[PDB]
Design a protein around this ligand. Sequence first.
Ligand SMILES: *[C@@H]1O[C@H](CO)[C@@H](O)[C@H](O)[C@H]1NC(C)=O
Ligand SMILES: *[C@@H]1O[C@H](CO)[C@@H](O)[C@H](O)[C@H]1NC(C)=O
Ligand SMILES: *[C@@H]1O[C@H](CO)[C@@H](O)[C@H](O)[C@H]1NC(C)=O
Ligand SMILES: *[C@@H]1O[C@H](CO)[C@@H](O)[C@H](O)[C@H]1NC(C)=O
Ligand SMILES: *[C@@H]1O[C@H](CO)[C@@H](O)[C@H](O)[C@H]1NC(C)=O
Lengths: 326, 326, 326, 326, 326
Amino acid sequence: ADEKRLLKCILHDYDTAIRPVQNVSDVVNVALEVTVVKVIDLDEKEHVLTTNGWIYHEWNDFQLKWNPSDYSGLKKIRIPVDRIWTPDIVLFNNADESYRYVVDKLAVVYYTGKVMWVPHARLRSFCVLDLSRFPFDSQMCTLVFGSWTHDVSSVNVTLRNQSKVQYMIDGKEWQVTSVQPKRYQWTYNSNENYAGIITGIKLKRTSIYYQYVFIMPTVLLAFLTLLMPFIPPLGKERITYGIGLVLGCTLLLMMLSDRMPTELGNVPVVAAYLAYVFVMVAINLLFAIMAINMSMQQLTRVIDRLLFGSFLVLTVVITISMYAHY
Amino acid sequence: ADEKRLLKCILHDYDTAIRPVQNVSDVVNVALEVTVVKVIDLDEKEHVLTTNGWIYHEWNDFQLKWNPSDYSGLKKIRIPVDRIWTPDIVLFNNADESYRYVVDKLAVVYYTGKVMWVPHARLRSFCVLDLSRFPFDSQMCTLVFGSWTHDVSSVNVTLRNQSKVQYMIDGKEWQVTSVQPKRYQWTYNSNENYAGIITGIKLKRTSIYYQYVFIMPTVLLAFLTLLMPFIPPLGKERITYGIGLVLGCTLLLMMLSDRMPTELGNVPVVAAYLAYVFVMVAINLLFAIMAINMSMQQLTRVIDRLLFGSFLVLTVVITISMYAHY
Amino acid sequence: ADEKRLLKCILHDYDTAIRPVQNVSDVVNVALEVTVVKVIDLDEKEHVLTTNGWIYHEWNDFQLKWNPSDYSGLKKIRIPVDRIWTPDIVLFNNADESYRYVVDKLAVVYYTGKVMWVPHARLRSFCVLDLSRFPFDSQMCTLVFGSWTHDVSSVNVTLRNQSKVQYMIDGKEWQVTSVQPKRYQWTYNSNENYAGIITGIKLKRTSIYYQYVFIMPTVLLAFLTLLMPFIPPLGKERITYGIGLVLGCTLLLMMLSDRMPTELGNVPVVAAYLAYVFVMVAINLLFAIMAINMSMQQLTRVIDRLLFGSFLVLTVVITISMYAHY
Amino acid sequence: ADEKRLLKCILHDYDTAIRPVQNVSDVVNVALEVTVVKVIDLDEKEHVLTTNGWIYHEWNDFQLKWNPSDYSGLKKIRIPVDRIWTPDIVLFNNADESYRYVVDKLAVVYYTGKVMWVPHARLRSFCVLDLSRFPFDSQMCTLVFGSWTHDVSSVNVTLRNQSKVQYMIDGKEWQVTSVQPKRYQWTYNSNENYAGIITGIKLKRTSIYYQYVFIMPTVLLAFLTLLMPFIPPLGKERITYGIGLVLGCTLLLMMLSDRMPTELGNVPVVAAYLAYVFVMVAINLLFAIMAINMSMQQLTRVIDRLLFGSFLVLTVVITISMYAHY
Amino acid sequence: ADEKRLLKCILHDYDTAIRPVQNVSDVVNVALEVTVVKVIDLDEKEHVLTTNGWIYHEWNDFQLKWNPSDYSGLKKIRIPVDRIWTPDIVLFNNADESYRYVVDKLAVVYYTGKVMWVPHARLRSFCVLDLSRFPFDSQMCTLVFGSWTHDVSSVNVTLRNQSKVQYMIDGKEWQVTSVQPKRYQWTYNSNENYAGIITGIKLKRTSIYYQYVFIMPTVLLAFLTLLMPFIPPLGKERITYGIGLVLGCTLLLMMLSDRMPTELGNVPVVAAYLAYVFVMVAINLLFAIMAINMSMQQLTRVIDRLLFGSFLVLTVVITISMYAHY
Ligand SMILES: *[C@@H]1O[C@H](CO)[C@@H](O)[C@H](O)[C@H]1NC(C)=O
Ligand SMILES: *[C@@H]1O[C@H](CO)[C@@H](O)[C@H](O)[C@H]1NC(C)=O
Ligand SMILES: *[C@@H]1O[C@H](CO)[C@@H](O)[C@H](O)[C@H]1NC(C)=O
Ligand SMILES: *[C@@H]1O[C@H](CO)[C@@H](O)[C@H](O)[C@H]1NC(C)=O
Ligand SMILES: *[C@@H]1O[C@H](CO)[C@@H](O)[C@H](O)[C@H]1NC(C)=O
């Protein structure tokens, strides 16, 4: 067949390690575009972002050149990348042992020498996230692609400006929206430059899981702690009520500590609210113990009334602040 | 032997990367049928479906052509796929790093050129599931198979209409039933088309695990919360009973939050019932605290009677609604 | 040396994909015997059985044939399986991504053409288990070995009847005993037959872990629930005692739900006993609340006496039934 | 260079599968010595021992023979094992899917034909452990190395008696000391013998983790249970104290069951002590309930005094026995 | 092209296993420098340090030698390491099964024969850590690189003194600072020396996670235990308050035991503080039980006053000591 003829012709002496430049003072312009098809997860416990997508490679191999008229058309031809040269472009913030692709067995080569690859992949990428508004947090995770072997004088990583589009994924957790990728240049020993593309995706947590697990038991334990100072001290049920709030808030803290990551810069607002509720139970237990201590003078109810007034107004302020965060 | 003769004959110049078309404007029709032998698990915590089954490949390789009379019969012959051409057909929603097969070492080739492969595999597939009726939920998970390298003008993925059958698996968890697969066409840059088969399987959770773990302690804690307002307030056991319900419902919430996934769109009905029970304990604690607060006028029992009446009728309505869900 | 001479002689034109039959209407009889050396674990949470053992292959390769007198003896010779033909026999219920062996680098070939392989392996096998008597359960897990590529007309999987022996392993968990393997024939599209061996091993759980963790706290919480109705109602300690049983039985339920698998057909007897204890605490709390409700007529002790009598006799019946299960 | 000359000379016709014997009735003596550099962990939950060390291979390859005077010295030469013959010696109790080495890329070959390998490795080995003295337990785990392909008539596994040394590792968990390795011979079908070395290492748990987590809360809950019968029954705080001990001992039991393995032969002494404390709380709750039951004759304090006396003397006996275990 | 000419010239007879020395009594000086770009995690539960960085190899291959004037410049050339010799330098304390690189597909070779490699990698390294000041602990973890095959007489591992720089990473967990690497020489059978570089990095935990999870509930439970002896004994709420502290401190202990590793040498200060709080609750429960025991002479308040005085002054001493640790 004619498809075997050009394949045996233009791969008769091809070496997969030779950089395809006609002159020694020349580079190859490798065009990249990462496109996410599905954001799988954002594991903040280990600061990884698991995602699925395809990275569009496009370079210009001048050694694979022919005219279609000698082969009766056939502009497109498909070669595995194990027999042609490929640029070593990997993630700059890879979060696993080795970088592997889902499909990497074919690459489209045109008659003008330009080569497309498009290997689909599952990318685990490190991305910095600040949990100062957990779980009502808007995020931004970056994927950095580039060459760690070839410098700028060997290859040139270029974004494609012909498709300056933006896309969105309406996940049930994250309302993922994309940011226009840019090129940022990393140096090496202040002489050699190692270029690379950077692509941000702006995650936005729209969750009903973390609200139901963390927001509503914390505000209801706050409600019970506010209901506590109407209990009269001379029956001996206020102290066991307070220690029940202590145990329930300890269980809620253990929930939160199981879910909140170690890799933490600032305290989340749900954690600060839970700490406020926990120390509020402590202060109310102090007031109950003092009240029953001098109950053995009996004009205690105005102290509990002003304590409920202060805790009511400050709890309304704190809850309104957390609602303004949401 | 004669089996070596045709193998050395029709693989004397075979290239595994050449697409087997006689004309350049021709495609190869690859027939697919996925068949599940056992659905292993549906991990909704990570939205994956682990299953075991074999995917039936069938294409037409015109380069492997011979007559049996020159080889004294032997219509069937078995070649490993590492020496012949195979289509790059993978899952469109694969949920692991790389796509691998359990057995992929043989493929049946006939004298008419048609090639069967049948590689058995363990497929981890992403599938969307809405847990609005957990755990009495009927589901539907899809397996999408197709080529991410060859377009429609190179290969053509075709369902086989000769076997339009349906099957079922009677698992102890899922009553798995199958749906007639169809073909859905995915586009690429609005010019190149990338076809593929889609196969739905309709899962149905028939579980006694999640009922015993979640349904019966929630309804029994509801029963205890309904029994609560018959306790007289002037003994100081109602408040510790209410905080015991608070701690028990917190433990049940921690059970549920351990089992309910983060990847959540809507709240499950067991979660809504547990939240209703938890806020019912909150309202009953408010009423008990108010009652013992003005116990220091003594006609409290009619308020507790009407409170039990309202909680009884609304609890019967909610439990009847959850039973109508089941 | 003479060992290289026959190796270069009878592998001078050997193809590893040719099925070794002299006539086209002939099969090769591959003799199998799986032998377990150690049953590692039975993970019922994922329905897998991890085991270690060697599978004894034995077939008849007529292409490796020589007389010892031309090579001065040397009946035994050892060839890696990468250079000779091997049958593609795998597990029919494999529970991992790919089937791999611990040692697969040598195979013994005799002068009569018969070939032994014996690759040792760690097998993860799916096996159906019914937990209707957890944890006093006698089990049976099956290992099915066969070819998914070669049919009956290509290879023939045969058990060896020369060694019809039975063995046993005295593990600290499982008293593992073996069952005589048999041959069961699986069909494919009702025309092609795909044979295979099946080997059952009869596990028997003899555990002191699950007894100490689950049986004794459940029966002691039953003992405390039986001790509950001797508490007089007019002191207000019966209700907090009952809610303490509620919280303790909730903790025990959370233990059991952590250990009991999701993949569940029937409720275990320890789970049914725990549910019975939990609803017994519910009924006793109902009776205590009613008693203290009409304590505000004072002839309550006969009701508690008959309640203890009914709960005593039915608890003795249930505990005797669970002991008869053991 | 001269280093390439002998490498091309004595590997000009080398086959990596030929067993290096001049006569057919001859074996090769492969000398083994495993040396542990660091014991990583002893996971008793899965009965594995993770360790790091190098296994010293030494055999006599008569096919790699030369005199140094023809190559101007160069007695030592270094060949990768992929081009020379190596004996297939693996662990007899391997605890992973496949046996792999950390470094296996070089092997030292001398001019006398003797070959050293020394591949460093991370070994996961099954070893039997009896937890009858957890966590004050002295242990012994074995590493068995041998050939599962070559029998005694092919290779001969030999310990080296020139280095009959013993070593020790002072870990913060295990005071690891080594035992002089010996040779134990395993049979196969009572005709073929499969030899192998066995090496015991005597672990000794010197832990402050398991003491602080398990020993001190159990003995302090024992202390609280002993303090319980001084509470007078006519205040209704003894029953809630006893149910608080029930809940605390249930939490401690859940700690222990999370840490104690399923793979259990005998109950640990900490588990027996916790069960004794738990049933002691049960007996004390029975005595408190009986006392408050006939409190409605008032000479109860001598019964509580003799009960404290019996529980004191038997608790001192049990604690002295557990201290004598330590 | 000219780039293929020298590649075919100086690799026309290259063997990848020959050590590149002109004389037999010569070594190759391999220059190493590990550089960390990001410290991923320090898992003290398994004593591993996961990090990302590149290790700078530099050796002198005299077999790859040419002048640029015969090839019109081109001093730099890039060869994959699979076709040239590379030194077998691995981690001496590797914490996984096999040592693999993220990128290892290229290596820069100059016209003077010196070869750079720079493979980026994710290193899991064992490092000793003493948790005597958890979580306010300054740490030091070491990475040891060297050859386990080539001795000092074959290769020579050398640090590069031209870059004696120090760097720092401002993580949200660890304020990572680097230490000047040195060379330490390991012996083998007291005759052969096996050199290697060692590089320390000085970690410093600056966390708000472990403080909020462990420090504040322990000090607040200490605060509640200090508030306990103002409760009058003749109401029967002191004992249930003490058992509530017992249950809350048990939950906090279970938090800590879940987070504190088994691999423990000394008790952490948070663990010692929690044990002190737990035994303080025990002593206060003893004093409350004694007080209510002889309440049935009534001058008890001075004993509780001196007990609060002693517990106040010793708690201030302990908390001031833990603050001086911080
Ligand atoms: C790489 O391509 C960009 C595209 O604009 C260009 O600006 C830059 O100079 C190029 N780098 C080179 C030629 O080294
Ligand atoms: C692929 O096969 C289907 C089968 O009906 C056909 O409808 C479709 O046109 C084919 N696609 C081509 C030929 O591009
Ligand atoms: C396979 O071997 C068994 C052994 O008895 C025999 O019964 C069966 O007929 C054989 N199958 C064939 C020859 O297809
Ligand atoms: C293997 O070596 C040991 C070393 O003493 C020897 O006793 C034994 O007989 C040898 N086995 C043979 C030669 O089969
Ligand atoms: C290795 O290099 C160091 C660098 O100073 C040198 O001191 C040492 O002697 C060398 N080792 C040899 C030549 O064996």
